Every structure is written in structure tokens, then in C-alpha cells.
DNA sequence: AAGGGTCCTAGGACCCT
DNA sequence: AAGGGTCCTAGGACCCT
């Protein structure tokens, strides 16, 4: 029942790439942008105050040297993205990815066979890879610190494949489930690691300081829970089972309550090939005729090169729109003829469109 | 891409059950009941006036010597189901169940590999077995019409096997897609079979009276139809696909209007295990507080009997219900440990009700 | 005028009796 | 006061940048 899990959580991906891509930019501080954001930032403009999401005009004028440049395209990100999972994979091949840039594995198969190999003698002589969270004391005879420790060699064997195959640096966290391992991931955070023992758990969660800091608790659930004076981890904790669900319901309030306690039982998942394949174009209502084709052959034409690649067949589309005030979206299947093509592709599209500041196209329901 | 698809469908199939179960009732015309309905009878009863889903008190009417049975646990009617699809799935593992009482196959393989065993000289003694629709002459030098009549004698075996194994009588169509094969199935329609040759798929079609006996035309589907005019077959293949797409959809026009002219590229699926398990308790407005409870522990029984003989696990429940006058429904996963019995369901779904003339409980997402 | 992902949910269309 | 099935759809919650 008991395993082993680590969180591989990327420093700075984006500008990591853009940094590997033009040398130039490294030791000058690095934003990456998207229209109006600074999505992401090196590390040197961290310390000049550049925060992840921040108005491109906020971050010059915390910082006019800012180099800034532009991330709308994520190809490269993505590439990169996979390059990272695809090696994890070559670890264990149960990986489960979140975003771009952070991996889940389960390590607890491959912790096990480590074990089976070594002798008592240097079992006493198992040592750990970087920290200790809230330094706590390893007891060399707790067979669950000694497989965290394990763990935690195996995360430092991977981040280290990492920088030496890919020249990307990052963190990783060790724990006994997934939420424990994302947590602990970033307790020491420019490009280092930290496992977790089982006593030190409830420090770990008690360690945060706003319920949105527990992955699950998003930008709904947190104002709900605000507005029933729920704020604390303990908060939480301790509210009525009964008045949490009936207000979130059975499913949101039995895991989100659970998540609080630092339990997470859901199993890493192998995530494999991308599930859809989505583009997007924004812009200040710059779209009021249906001329917006125009923007919907571009959205195609990549997407069309990136699902030839791939090699599997999406058997849906779907367009999404945004209007000047939620998103709303049409899609269809896809002609059995069409899988096997721009110019039936936009007329779909188009058809989609009429029957409905952003335009989006998606393929899923991949074959 | 040329296709022998076989479509086989029962005869008054819950008839059949209960005739086999207790032989006094054949002869003797046979109803079976749900509630005010008359859900089937046997060919007796059919001739003397009854029809499927006639009120118990015209069919009293029409034949008051009428015997009827019980019909509203379907576990015995189920059960003879899939020992159908099973027999079947033994002569070619690719079957597509359609309800209860109606499988399809894919014989290309099949068909294929037999004619590969002839030598020429035989081939010239390829025979059907059953009805040629419209009584259209066989071109022996067709090897579409060979190759069709060599599924209608895999149909017939198939029928003789059901027939031998299991006690039960049916219908068998033969065509080069699952559109056709439905349609032709019932042209000799108490226990026979007949084969559609493609000179006479246009001949089929236009048999039809009203769209809606087009399988994959329903109730809206028709009456949006009738509302543009659209009434026979041909109205549908001549109408205009531009009106047709934004009146429907491009989704329901593109595919509906291919069905009008007998086209039909979906692929036989493999049904394999139920996606989901339910059942249903309808009355006269006859719960009206929460000790509806008890009608709800009362499906769980028999539902967790059945998952569990099932041997795969759900991971989610759904409770659904209808107010006096659409019906609605609240699901939710199924926790962990209890996967792996009555007490905790009975509160979710009370929980599940709480946020909310019939009850039903469905246990889906299974793995 | 981010730009991507994941899975779930309630309802609705269809199929058969 | 049928009693079962199938898959799709638009939207919404969450994750990351």
C-alpha cells in the first residue's frame, strides 16, 4: 500500500528554453511574454521583483532592463515538454504529467527492486539526496524512511539525466503520495530537492498560509469555502463533514477534506500521448466579421501539421469563441473521408462558427 | 472496403423467455407486461390484435383470452441476451449488440476466408440460404453477390446454432453495411432471413413510408423534419444539405442524409461487457418522502449483486428521478475503499437525492 | 487581446423491448 | 407508474505557464 512518489517540477521552463536557444539571454534578467503578461521570468528577474502572470508594463517598471521575449508559440515549449516526460519514462514508465512542465512517478516498484538488491550491510549505509524536510531526523530502521531515502537517490539520478540530456535544471520532491510530493517539491526551490518522512507531514500542510495552496482547490472552491469562514489548512480540517457536503458536494467536499489532512490515495497515471490538440488566438475585440476565417486557416494550418506528426486521427473538432463582456464552443465529428483537407476543414469550422476577443481550435477524440 | 455484415434479431424476444420457461403458455396468445404496457407478445397474440407497447387495456380488448406474464425484471431476458451475443461472438469475435435482441457482425473476414477454401468448380454452386431481397436475380460472376451469399450462409448457420443451443428463433439480414442489414432483416420477419444484393439497396430505401423508420432518425430528428416539409425518403436525399446542416447540424444533416440514400461507413464495434448497469422503479406519483429510501436500497441490492458477479468494479453511481409533469439526475465517484458495502451507498445517494414518480440508480465509469 | 492541458457532469439524441 | 442501453455535447472545475 505504501509507495513512493516523486513530483518533478521544472524551474522556469519557459525561459529555461528560451535561455538554451539564445545564450545572450542568460545572466540578463529574462521575462517571457504572452500579449500583455509576463508569463514567466529567469531567475535573475525574480530577484529584481518580476512575478509569474505580471503586466508587461508592471515589469518594466519594476524593471526596465527586462529583456523581453515572446511565448505565444509553445511548440518549443512542448517539444521540450516531452522530451523531459519521455525520459523520466525511461526511469519508470508510469509517468503522469501536469502542465508542461512538472511529472508524476511512481518510483515505489523501482525503490523496491533497489532494495531487494542490497545487502543488510549497506542498507545501514543508505543515505539521502538533498533535503530533508523540516530537517527531520532519518531513522535508518523505519523501512519507510529508508524507501523514501531510495526515493530521493532516484529523484537526484533523474534531475541529474535531466540537465546532462536535456540542459534543464529543476526540482524534484519525494513523498508518499502525489499531493505530499508536490508540496515538498518546492520547500527549497532554485533547482533542488527535498523528501518528505512521514512525521513531518502535517508540518508540511500546516505550512501553508491560504486553502488555494492545496492543489484541488481552485479559484471556485477556495471562494466558497472563504464564504464559510473556512481559511486555514486546520480550517478545513476540522468544518463539518455533513455542511461540506451539502454545499460542494459529495465529491468535491469528501476529497478536498481528505486533501487537507495530507491524504491522497489517487494513483499516478500514465499520461502517453496528448488527449486533444488546441490553438488559440486572442486579441482586443479585433474580430467582428466573418472575415475571422482568415484566423481560423491559421489555427488550422498548424494544428494540421501537428496531428499529422503525432500519427493518430482526431475524430472531433470543436471551435471556441470569446465574447466582449465563460467561452463558448461547437464541435462535430469529423468526416470519415476528412481523417484520411484544409478547405473541408474550415467550412465545418465556419458552419460551427455561425451557429455561435478569442478564437480557438481544438482536436479531440483521438483514434 | 467492400463489407458482409449480418444483422440478427430476435423474435419477440421477452416472449420467447417466458415460452421456454413455462411451454404451457405457448399456443396460447402471450403478453409481456410492464406496468400499463404490453412491452411484447408472442406471433399468437399478434395475429389476434396486439401490438408492442399496447396498453393492458386495449390489448384486453382486442383479446380478452390474452395471457401476461410479468416483465419488469429484465435479469432472465438480460442473461439469454448475452449468451446470444456470446454464440454469436464464437463465429466472428466482432459483435456490435443493439438492445437486447439485436446483435450485428462483421462476416468480411469470414466470408473471405471461406471463399479463399473454394476451387473454382464449386464456386459456381455458391447457393443463398433464405430470401433474396425484391427477389433479384443472382450474377453468379458477381463477386459481390458471391461474397453475400456466402454471409447468408454463415447467417444461416448462425441461426441454426442459436436456434439448437439456445432454444431460440430469429431473423437474420445480410447487406454490406449495418444500415441495410437492419433494414433488410425484417423484410420476412417471423424467423427467417433474407439477403440484400446492392442492385436492389435503392429498391430498399424507398420501401420505407415515414423517415423516422430510418434507424437513426427519432423523435426530434423526424419532427424537425416534418416541420421543413421533409416526409418521404427521397425528400431527405433531395433536400437541400445547406438547410439541412444549419437547420440540425452538421453532424446530424451530413450523417442522416447519407442513411437517406443507404450509406453507411460505421464500423461493426465490439460491444464486449456493458458500459454501465441500472435500474428503474416507476409508480403513480406514489413517493412523496424521503423514506424513498427504502425503494433505493431496494435497487442497490440487485444492483450490487450484479456488479459484483460482474467481477469489474464501478467507480461511479448516478441517481436519477421523475417529477410530476425530461428527468434528472446527480452522480458522483464512488470512494476508494468502498470499491472494494450497503450502508455507505445508501447515504451518497440520499445525499445525492437530497440535492435534488421514478427512481433508478446507475453504476457507471466501470474498470 | 496568455496559452495551453485534464477529467467530470447533467442532459439530450439515438437504439431496442 | 416500461425498463433497459449507447455515445455525444457544452460547459465547468481543476492543473501549469
Request: hydrophobic letters at 35%.
Given at each position: 500500500s505504501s509507495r513512493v512518489i516523486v513530483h518533478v517540477d521544472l524551474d522556469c521552463f519557459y525561459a529555461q528554453v528560451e535561455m538554451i536557444s539564445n545564450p545572450?539571454?542568460?545572466?540578463?534578467?529574462?521575462?517571457?511574454?504572452?500579449?500583455?503578461?509576463?508569463?514567466?521570468?529567469?531567475?535573475?528577474?525574480?530577484?529584481?521583483?518580476?512575478?509569474?502572470?505580471?503586466?508587461?508594463?508592471?515589469?518594466?517598471?519594476?524593471?526596465?532592463?527586462?529583456?523581453?521575449?515572446?511565448?505565444?508559440?509553445?511548440?518549443?515549449?512542448?517539444?521540450?515538454?516531452?522530451?523531459?516526460?519521455?525520459?523520466?519514462?525511461?526511469?519508470?514508465?508510469?509517468?503522469?504529467?501536469?502542465?508542461?512542465?512538472?511529472?508524476?512517478?511512481?518510483?515505489?516498484?523501482?525503490?523496491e527492486k533497489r532494495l531487494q538488491q542490497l545487502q543488510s550491510d549497506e542498507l545501514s549505509a543508505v543515505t539521502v539526496s538533498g533535503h530533508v524536510y523540516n530537517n527531520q531526523s532519518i531513522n535508518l530502521l523505519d523501512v519507510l524512511h529508508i524507501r523514501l531515502l531510495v526515493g530521493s537517490q532516484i529523484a537526484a539520478e533523474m534531475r541529474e539525466a535531466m540537465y546532462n540530456q536535456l540542459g534543464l535544471t529543476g526540482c524534484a520532491g519525494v513523498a508518499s503520495n502525489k499531493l505530499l510530493a508536490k508540496?515538498?517539491?518546492?520547500?527549497?526551490?532554485?533547482?533542488?530537492?527535498?523528501?518528505?518522512?512521514?512525521?513531518?507531514?502535517?508540518?508540511?500542510?500546516?505550512?501553508?498560509?491560504?486553502?488555494?495552496?492545496?492543489?484541488?482547490?481552485?479559484?471556485?472552491?477556495?471562494?466558497?469555502?472563504?464564504?464559510?469562514?473556512?481559511?486555514?489548512?486546520?480550517?478545513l480540517q476540522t468544518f463539518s463533514p455533513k455542511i461540506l457536503e451539502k454545499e460542494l458536494g459529495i465529491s468535491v467536499a469528501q476529497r478536498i477534506q481528505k486533501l487537507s489532512f495530507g491524504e491522497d490515495n489517487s494513483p499516478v497515471i500514465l499520461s502517453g500521448p496528448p488527449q486533444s490538440f488546441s490553438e488559440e488566438d486572442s486579441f482586443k475585440k479585433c474580430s467582428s466579421e466573418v472575415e475571422?476565417?482568415?484566423?481560423?486557416?491559421?489555427?488550422?494550418?498548424?494544428?494540421?501539421?501537428?496531428?499529422?506528426?503525432?500519427?493518430?486521427?482526431?475524430?472531433?473538432?470543436?471551435?471556441?469563441?470569446?465574447?466582449?463582456?465563460?467561452?463558448?464552443?461547437?464541435?462535430?465529428?469529423?468526416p470519415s473521408h476528412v481523417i484520411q483537407v484544409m478547405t473541408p476543414m474550415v467550412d465545418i469550422l465556419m458552419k460551427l462558427f455561425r451557429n455561435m476577443t478569442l478564437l480557438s481550435v481544438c482536436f479531440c477524440n483521438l483514434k
Open positions: 545572450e539571454l542568460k545572466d540578463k534578467p529574462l521575462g517571457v511574454q504572452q500579449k500583455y503578461l509576463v508569463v514567466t521570468c529567469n531567475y535573475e528577474a525574480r530577484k529584481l521583483g518580476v512575478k509569474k502572470l505580471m503586466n508587461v508594463r508592471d515589469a518594466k517598471e519594476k524593471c526596465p532592463q527586462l529583456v523581453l521575449v515572446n511565448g505565444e508559440d509553445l511548440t518549443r515549449y512542448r517539444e521540450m515538454s516531452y522530451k523531459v516526460t519521455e525520459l523520466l519514462e525511461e526511469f519508470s514508465p508510469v509517468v503522469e504529467r501536469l502542465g508542461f512542465d512538472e511529472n508524476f512517478v511512481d518510483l515505489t516498484e523501482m525503490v508540496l515538498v517539491s518546492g520547500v527549497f526551490k532554485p533547482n533542488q530537492q527535498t523528501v518528505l518522512l512521514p512525521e513531518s507531514c502535517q508540518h508540511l500542510i500546516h505550512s501553508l498560509n491560504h486553502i488555494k495552496e492545496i492543489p484541488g482547490i481552485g479559484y471556485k472552491t477556495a471562494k466558497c469555502l472563504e464564504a464559510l469562514g473556512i481559511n486555514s489548512v486546520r480550517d475571422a476565417k482568415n484566423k481560423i486557416e491559421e489555427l488550422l494550418a498548424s494544428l494540421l501539421n501537428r496531428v499529422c506528426q503525432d500519427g493518430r486521427k482526431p475524430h472531433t473538432v470543436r471551435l471556441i469563441i470569446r465574447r466582449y463582456s465563460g467561452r463558448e464552443s461547437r464541435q462535430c465529428p469529423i
